[PDB]
């Protein structure tokens, strides 16, 4: 038994590497960034017909111009989401402007390695967060998608999958993606890919989709709007 801040001989923090393995236990989520907006799609993973599907929430609104899709240990995500929300509102309070997608992701990512068992407050984080996140939104740099993992590393991505089937899904994304791709095409593509990789038959109850566009605020798709998109697929 070893401390939570022990390095392995290969120069990695065991807890961070193990936290990255927990991401593979989460449902697949997909983010695609186009010139007309970004879309976020996520497999819900319904475990019983008695469970209410709308009570699974794996895409959330950060601010009007920023959505977040998550995969891994979802309970761990809550304090990260709340930090993103609070940060964008503080930024608005102080500067009277929208915080950039990059800046939000950066703020959240600075929480990442803040665990340990004898530097800090009477009970601060004991372990890293078992969560990966896709921040999708629009700011003055245009539509934007960023990935973040438990290491605290974050990076802009033209398209990205996370969760159990992300190798697989990422392969299909390199195939279908191009820079001049439309938003409606990116929406179709990500459902096509989710359909492939999901264990269950895809339908309008066991997935979520959300978009953010230059014109329009963060928008969660309704049952009716999902059914419309599912027809071609």
């Amino acid at each position: 038994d070893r401390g939570v801040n022990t390095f392995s001989p290969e120069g990695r923090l065991f807890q961070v590497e193990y936290a990255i393995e927990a991401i593979k236990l989460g449902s697949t989520a997909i983010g695609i960034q186009t010139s007309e907006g970004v879309c976020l799609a996520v497999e819900k993973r319904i475990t019983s017909p008695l469970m209410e599907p709308s009570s699974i929430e794996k895409i959330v609104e950060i601010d009007a111009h920023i959505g977040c899709a998550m995969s891994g240990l979802i309970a761990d995500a809550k304090t990260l989401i709340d930090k993103a929300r609070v940060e964008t509102q503080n930024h608005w309070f102080t500067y009277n402007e929208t915080m950039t997608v990059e800046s939000v992701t950066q703020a959240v990512s600075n929480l990442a390695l803040q665990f340990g068992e004898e530097d800090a407050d009477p009970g601060a984080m004991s372990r890293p967060f078992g969560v990966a996140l896709l921040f999708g939104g629009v700011d003055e740099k245009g539509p934007q998608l960023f990935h973040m993992d438990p290491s605290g590393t974050f990076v802009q991505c033209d398209a990205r999958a996370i969760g159990s089937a992300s190798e697989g899904a990422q392969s299909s994304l390199q195939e279908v993606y191009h820079k001049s791709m439309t938003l409606k095409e990116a929406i179709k593509s990500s459902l096509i890919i989710l359909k492939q990789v999901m264990e269950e038959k895809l339908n309008a109850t066991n997935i979520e989709l959300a978009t953010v566009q230059p014109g329009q605020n963060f928008h969660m798709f309704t049952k009716e709007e999902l059914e419309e998109v599912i027809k071609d697929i």
């Binding site: 390095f7 001989p9 290969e10 600075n110 605290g152 990076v155």
Partner: protein, 234 residues
């Protein structure tokens, strides 16, 4: 084995394995080169892209008008240290209305980064930095390590396959002091290019450049802004 989990445990050969392991974090980072002339300090960095569709990790960071850094190792530790450095620079301008000297900043890094190497349950910083600066004593390239040691360099490279870049830099270092800026970056890019598998080339997607000097605040060139420096590697 029983000597390699705690940074407070000396081995029976007088080593600290946790420090050595932290140093591996920097050895496995992508390569970066730092070099200087009489008038300028340059940083040059390879940005590792996770997928084909990922942007490419930022490797160069602004610290103050007269200082920028290149990173290799854990990104989160890089930011924490970069933020520390930024703060020490602001404090110095607030108090004295003049730039923090680069050697003094570096000393503060050493002092700061040593502390957790001696206390139980703490860990080394898993990051190494090349530090480019300009001050009253001219251009500087420093190197910092997880061990808290630091080095004042004529030039340096860290990260994966950096031994190749180090060898190139040794070969041509006698030329550096008298180089114009373009030549000096050319040299930095050539050194970086040695670290690559023979297939691969330097591109505008994978090179990042940082420059500070006598007439020039620390500035970062990415993507289309590196094109001028890559053309005429002739």
């Amino acid at each position: 084995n029983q000597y390699d989990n705690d940074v407070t445990v000396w081995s029976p050969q007088g080593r600290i394995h946790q420090i050595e392991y932290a140093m591996e974090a920097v050895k496995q980072g992508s390569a970066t080169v730092g070099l200087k002339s009489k008038t300028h300090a340059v940083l040059v960095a390879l940005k590792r892209a996770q997928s084909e569709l990922a942007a490419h990790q930022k490797k160069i960071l602004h610290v103050d008008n007269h200082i920028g850094i290149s990173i290799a190792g854990l990104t989160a530790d890089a930011r924490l240290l970069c933020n520390f450095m930024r703060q020490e620079c602001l404090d110095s301008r607030f108090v004295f209305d003049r730039p923090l000297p680069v050697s003094r900043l570096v000393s503060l890094i050493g002092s700061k980064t040593q502390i957790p190497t001696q206390r139980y349950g703490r860990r080394p910083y898993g990051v190494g930095l090349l530090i480019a600066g300009y001050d009253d004593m001219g251009p500087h390239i420093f190197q910092t390590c997880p061990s808290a040691n630091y080095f004042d360099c004529r030039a340096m490279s860290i990260g994966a396959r950096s031994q190749s870049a180090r060898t190139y830099l040794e070969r041509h270092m006698s030329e550096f002091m008298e180089c114009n800026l373009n030549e000096l970056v050319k040299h930095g890019l050539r050194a970086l290019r040695e670290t690559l598998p023979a297939e691969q080339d330097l591109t505008t997607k994978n090179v990042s450049i940082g420059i500070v000097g006598k007439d020039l605040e620390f500035t970062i060139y990415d993507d289309d802004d590196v094109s001028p420096f890559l053309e005429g590697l002739e």
